[PDB]
C-alpha cells in the first residue's frame, strides 16, 4: 500500500482504480490523471468511496471528508472537507511531492485500448517505466481476451487422431495451433485432475501434442490464462565497453570450434550485452558452443523464447561439450531433458524463460529475439543479472503472435526495444557466412534486408522454381481455405518429381490440415519453426491478403529448403527483383 509513483518515484499511498494494473500514482500525478481522463476511481489504504449507508458513489472529485469516513454532497456533515482540491489529492506524503510533466503520454498509455498502430508506436516511444507498464498491460489485455473464451465440454473420445469436443454457447472457435497452448484440467468428484498439454489440428481432430491420456468424461480443455507478475528490471541495461576482462579467461590454447569465434569473444568480452545477428543456418547455433570452451571458467547461460525452439539449444551442448558441464531446467512441459535437472551449481544451463532457478551469472545467451517483447527482455534481465550476454536472432524473421493489431503490420522497428536498438545504431554483430546454403537466399534477402554483406558460398544451379500462378482466397472462419490449393497441389505435382518430399509452410493451418487429409504433406508452423526445416521445402500460395506477405514472414521461409526452394509468387510479393526459374503448368 506504500511505494514509489511511476513518474516522480516519490512515496505515495494512492492507487488508480480505473487502470487494469492498478499503478502507483503520485498525488499531483493522481490529480492530473483523474482530471484529463475518465479514470474517476482512486484507491488508498482504504477505498475512496462514499461510506454512507444506502449510498453508492464511486467518484473522487465528488466526495467530502467528514469525521473519520468519506461522504458525498448528499451526506456531508457540517464538518466537511473536499478530498479533490488544490489540484492535489489527499493522501500520505502530500508535502514531499515534486510532480511531473509526462502526464499526457502516460494518459495515452493508460487510455490506449490497444487498437491501432499508434498504440505500439507510443508503447515503444516513452520512458522506461512506461515501457514496462505498457508491456505489462498489453499482455494483461491479450490474456484477458483469450480467457474470454468458453470451456471445451468433452464427455467421450473416439480414438487417437480423433476427438469430439464442444465449446460453450456464444463463444467462437479459439485459435488453432501450439502458438495458443491447450492445457486443461478435468474434475472427478471434488477437485481438478490432469488432462494433458495438447493442441488441436482441425475440425476430425488430430493430436499434435506429446502425450495420450484416458480422455473422456468431464474433460475441460482450456487455453490456460495465467496471472501476470509485475516486472522488476528494465528491458535492457545500458552497456559500457570494459577495459579489463573481469572473470573472463581467454585460454592459453585456441578451442577452434569456429575461426571467427575468436573475434566473437574479442568484442563480446567488453560490452554489457551483444547479439548474434544470424541469418538462418549461418552460425546461429554453435558460436556459443565454441564460447563454451574458449571461456570455460565463465558462468554461461542459455535460453530461448519458446519450448519448441530448443533444438540447437540442446543438441550440440551434449554432442560436443563435456557431459557434466551441462545442466537442465524443465518444469514438471514436454521438452528435451537431456541434461541433469535439479542441479544449482553448473556453468552451462539450458532452458527457456518460463522458469529458472534464481541465480546471477556473467555470461548469458538468449535466442529468438524476433518474437520477443520487452516483457521477456525485462524478465530475463531480472531473473539473470549478468555482465555480458547475446540476443540470438535477426530482424529478418517473424513477429510475436500479436493478434491484437489488425490494421497495420508490426515492422522490424517495432519488435522490441533491443530489436530497434540494433536497428538505429547498428547491430552488435554481423555475420556473412552461410553454413550450408546456395546463393538464392543470399541474393533475395541481401537485396531485401541483408544489404549484401553475405555472398555466394554455395553455387546457384537454379533448380528452385517460381511460377506465374496467382490463386483465389475465400474466408469461412478464423481460418480460411484455398480452392487454388486443393487443385493446385495436384497441378504442381503433375510431373515435377522433386518437390514430393517438401515441407508445407502454413499461413493457414486449416488449409495445411486439409492438404494432409487430401494429398498429405507435413504441417510446418510459421512462427515457431526455425531450425526444424528440412533440406527440401515448398513455399505454397495459401494467401493473397495482408495476413503474411509484406516483408518479414518469408525472409526465413525462403531459407527453409536448401537447394530446391519452390517459392512461387503468390501475391504482391517482391516479383521484379531477381532471377528465378519457372515451369508453366499445362
Amino acid at each position: 500500500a506504500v511505494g514509489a509513483c511511476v513518474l516522480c518515484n516519490s512515496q505515495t499511498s494512492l492507487r488508480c482504480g480505473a487502470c487494469i494494473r492498478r499503478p502507483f500514482l503520485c498525488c499531483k500525478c493522481c490529480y492530473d490523471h483523474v482530471i484529463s481522463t475518465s479514470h474517476k476511481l482512486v484507491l488508498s489504504v482504504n477505498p475512496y468511496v462514499c461510506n454512507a449507508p444506502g449510498c453508492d458513489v464511486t467518484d473522487v472529485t465528488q466526495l467530502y471528508l467528514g469525521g473519520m469516513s468519506y461522504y458525498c454532497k448528499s451526506h456531508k456533515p457540517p464538518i466537511s472537507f473536499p478530498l479533490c482540491a488544490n489540484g492535489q489529492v489527499f493522501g500520505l506524503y502530500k508535502n514531499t511531492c515534486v510532480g511531473s510533466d509526462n502526464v499526457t503520454d502516460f494518459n495515452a498509455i493508460a487510455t490506449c485500448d490497444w487498437t491501432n498502430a499508434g498504440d505500439y508506436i507510443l508503447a515503444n516511444t516513452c520512458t522506461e517505466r512506461l515501457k514496462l507498464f505498457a508491456a505489462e498491460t498489453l499482455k494483461a489485455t491479450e490474456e484477458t481476451f483469450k480467457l474470454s473464451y468458453g470451456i471445451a465440454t468433452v464427455r467421450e473420445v473416439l480414438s487417437d487422431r480423433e476427438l469430439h469436443l464442444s465449446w460453450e454457447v456464444g463463444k467462437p472457435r479459439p485459435p488453432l495451433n501450439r502458438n495458443y497452448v491447450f492445457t486443461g484440467y478435468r474434475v472427478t468428484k471434488n477437485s481438478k485432475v490432469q488432462i494433458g498439454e495438447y493442441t488441436f489440428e482441425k475440425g476430425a481432430v488430430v493430436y499434435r501434442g506429446t502425450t495420450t491420456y484416458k480422455l473422456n468424461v468431464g474433460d475441460y480443455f482450456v487455453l490456460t490464462s495465467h496471472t501476470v507478475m509485475p516486472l522488476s528490471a528494465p528491458t535492457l541495461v545500458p552497456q559500457e565497453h570494459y577495459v579489463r576482462i573481469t572473470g573472463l579467461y581467454p585460454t592459453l590454447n585456441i578451442s577452434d570450434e569456429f575461426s571467427s569465434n575468436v573475434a566473437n569473444y574479442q568484442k563480446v568480452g567488453m560490452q554489457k550485452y551483444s547479439t548474434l545477428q544470424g541469418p538462418p543456418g549461418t552460425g546461429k547455433s554453435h558460436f556459443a558452443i565454441g564460447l563454451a570452451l574458449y571461456y570455460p571458467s565463465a558462468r554461461i547461460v542459455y535460453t530461448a523464447c519458446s519450448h519448441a525452439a530448443v533444438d540447437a539449444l540442446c543438441e550440440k551442448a551434449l554432442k560436443y561439450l563435456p557431459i557434466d558441464k551441462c545442466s537442465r531446467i524443465i518444469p514438471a512441459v514436454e521438452c528435451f531433458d537431456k541434461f541433469k535437472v535439479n542441479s544449482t551449481l553448473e556453468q552451462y544451463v539450458f532452458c527457456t524463460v518460463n522458469a529458472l532457478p534464481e541465480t546471477t551469472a556473467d555470461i548469458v545467451v538468449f535466442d529468438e529475439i524476433s518474437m520477443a517483447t520487452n516483457y521477456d527482455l525485462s524478465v530475463v534481465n531480472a531473473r539473470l543479472r549478468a555482465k555480458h550476454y547475446v540476443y540470438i536472432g535477426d530482424p529478418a524473421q517473424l513477429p510475436a503472435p500479436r493478434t491484437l493489431l489488425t490494421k497495420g503490420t508490426l515492422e522490424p522497428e517495432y519488435f522490441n526495444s533491443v530489436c530497434r536498438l540494433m536497428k538505429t545504431i547498428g547491430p552488435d554483430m554481423f555475420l556473412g557466412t552461410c553454413r550450408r546454403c546456395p546463393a538464392e537466399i543470399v541474393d533475395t534477402v541481401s537485396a531485401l534486408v541483408y544489404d549484401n554483406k553475405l555472398k555466394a558460398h554455395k553455387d546457384k544451379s537454379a533448380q528452385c522454381f517460381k511460377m506465374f500462378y496467382k490463386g483465389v482466397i475465400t474466408h469461412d472462419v478464423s481460418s480460411a481455405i484455398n480452392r487454388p490449393q486443393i487443385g493446385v497441389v495436384r497441378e504442381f505435382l503433375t510431373r515435377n518429381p522433386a518437390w514430393r518430399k517438401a515441407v508445407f509452410i502454413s499461413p493457414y493451418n486449416s488449409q495445411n490440415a486439409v492438404a494432409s487429409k487430401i494429398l498429405g504433406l507435413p504441417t510446418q508452423t510459421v512462427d515457431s519453426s526455425q531450425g526444424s526445416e528440412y533440406d527440401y521445402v515448398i513455399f505454397t500460395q495459401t494467401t493473397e491478403t495482408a495476413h503474411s506477405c509484406n516483408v518479414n514472414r518469408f525472409n526465413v521461409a525462403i531459407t527453409r529448403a536448401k537447394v530446391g526452394i519452390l517459392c512461387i509468387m503468390s501475391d504482391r510479393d517482391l516479383y521484379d527483383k531477381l532471377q528465378f526459374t519457372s515451369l508453366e503448368i499445362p
Binding site: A1, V2, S13, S44, V45, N46, L65, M68, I79, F81, F90, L92, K94
Partner: protein
Amino acid sequence: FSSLPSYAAFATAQEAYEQAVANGDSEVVLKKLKKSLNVAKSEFDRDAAMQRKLEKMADQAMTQMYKQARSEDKRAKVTSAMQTMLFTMLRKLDNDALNNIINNARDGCVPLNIIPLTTAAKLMVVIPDYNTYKNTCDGTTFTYASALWEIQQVVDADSKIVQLSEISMDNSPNLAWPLIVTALRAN
C-alpha cells in the same frame, strides 16, 4: 492565518475606516466605522476558527492512515515468518517410517504420543545420579522402547564432554551430575 479570503476585505475596510477617523470627520462617520469594523471582525471570526478545526481533523486522519499502513506491513512480515518456520520444520519428518506406521492404521488416525516413540532417530536421556545411571544406560548399547540404541556422546550440566571411562562410583562426586546422554537407533 494571514491570507484568508476575508482578510483582504477586513484589512481594507479597517484601513479606510481608520483613515476616515484620522481625518477628523463628524460622528456619523465614526458610527459607520464602528459598525463596519464590528461586522468585519465578526465575519473574520468564523473564517479564522473553522479553518483551524479542519486542519487538525486532517492531521488526525493522516496519522491514523499512517499507523494502519504500518500495521499492515507488520502483518505481512509475520505471515512470511510463520510460513518459513512451518516449511523449515517440515523437512525432518522421516517420510518412510512415518508412512509405514500411518498405512497400518485402520483409518489414518494415530495417537501423537507414539510418533516419536517409533519414528525418531535420536534419543536423549537425563540422569540424576550414578545409581540411576547404572540401571538405565550402562555400557555402550542399551535397550529402551523395544529398540536398541548405542551411545554417541555424553555431556554434563555445564555442556562439556565426558568420557565413559570416568563415570564410576569413586569418581561420581566430581561431575556436574545432570548428565545428558545421546544415542542413535541401531539398524
